[PDB]
Each structure stands twice: as structure tokens, then as C-alpha cells.
Amino acid sequence: SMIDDDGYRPNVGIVICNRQGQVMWARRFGQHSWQFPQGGINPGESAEQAMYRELFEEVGLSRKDVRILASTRNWLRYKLPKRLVRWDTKPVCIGQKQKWFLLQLVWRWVSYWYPVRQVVSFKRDVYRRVMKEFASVVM
Numbered sequence: 342s343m344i345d346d347d348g349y350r351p352n353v354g355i356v357i358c359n360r361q362g363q364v365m366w367a368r369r370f371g372q373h374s375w376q377f378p379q380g381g382i383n384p385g386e387s388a389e390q391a392m393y394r395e396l397f398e399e400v401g402l403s404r405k406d407v408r409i410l411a412s413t414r415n416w417l418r419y420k421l422p423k424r425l426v427r428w429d430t431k432p433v434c435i436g437q438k439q440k441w442f443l444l445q446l447v448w449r450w451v452s453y454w455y456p457v458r459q460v461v462s463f464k465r466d467v468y469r470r471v472m473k474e475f476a477s478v479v480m
């Protein structure tokens with residue numbers, strides 16, 4: 342994933358829901374690391390392409406297994422806390438620009454809003470923004 346001219350790293354995120362309104366989250370890295378699937382967008386690659394790559398890698402699913410219900414048409418941008426920035430590597434990455442996808446099936450299930458409260462502190466505000474946007478699709 343290449344850093345853009347503003348210093349943002351492009352990423353994709355996936356929210357898979359079921360017909361009961363639960364959402365899926367998976368261990369990003371080992372025990373207790375439950376998070377929505379998320380990964381970088383590489384050069385010469387659309388967000389949708391990156392989404393299917395992350396879906397296959399994290400969940401073992403492909404396009405046939407899911408229906409896209411919604412996505413962020415533009416970017417969800419946020420700045421890293423300054424103490425998380427890798428200040429000695431150029432170009433310096435100061436944030437992420439993210440495209441999120443809401444999927445439904447054609448890891449564990451939790452209530453839709455549960456991840457907003459329970460995810461690691463660093464991603465709570467991003468999760469709140471994402472789930473608020475997708476609320477207009479599912480509520």
C-alpha cells in the first residue's frame with residue numbers, strides 16, 4: 342500500500358452482516374484481537390478488488406458467497422494519533438483513507454453496535470462513523 346501525496350495510506354474495511362442484524366468480526370492478530378477485516382489497497386487496484394482479497398484472506402470467502410449492500414463512495418479519512426506515527430521513515434504516513442464495504446452472506450457474530458463500544462480504543466471513532474453511515478442502509 343502506497344502513501345498518497347497528503348500522507349494517507351489507502352485501506353479497505355469489511356462489515357459482514359447476517360439477516361438477524363448481527364455483524365462478523367475476526368481475530369486480526371491472535372487472541373482477543375477481534376476486529377472487522379481490514380487491509381491495504383495496493384497500486385493499480387480498486388477498493389473492490391482489495392476488498393475481495395481481504396475477504397478471501399481473512400474469512401476464506403469469495404464474491405459468490407457475499408452480496409454487497411453498500412460502500413463508501415469516497416474516502417473516510419482520519420489522522421493517526423501523533424505518538425503512533427513512524428516519524429523516521431519517509432514518506433511519513435500520518436493517517437489512513439478508508440473505503441468500507443457492507444456485505445451480507447448469500448470468526449464470531451456480535452450485535453451491530455457492539456464493535457463500536459468493544460473494539461480497541463484506537464478504532465472506536467472510525468467504527469462509530471462506519472456503522473452510523475451503514476445504519477441508513479439497514480435500519
Ligand SMILES: [Ca+2]
Binds near residue numbers: 380395399
Ligand atoms: Ca487484513
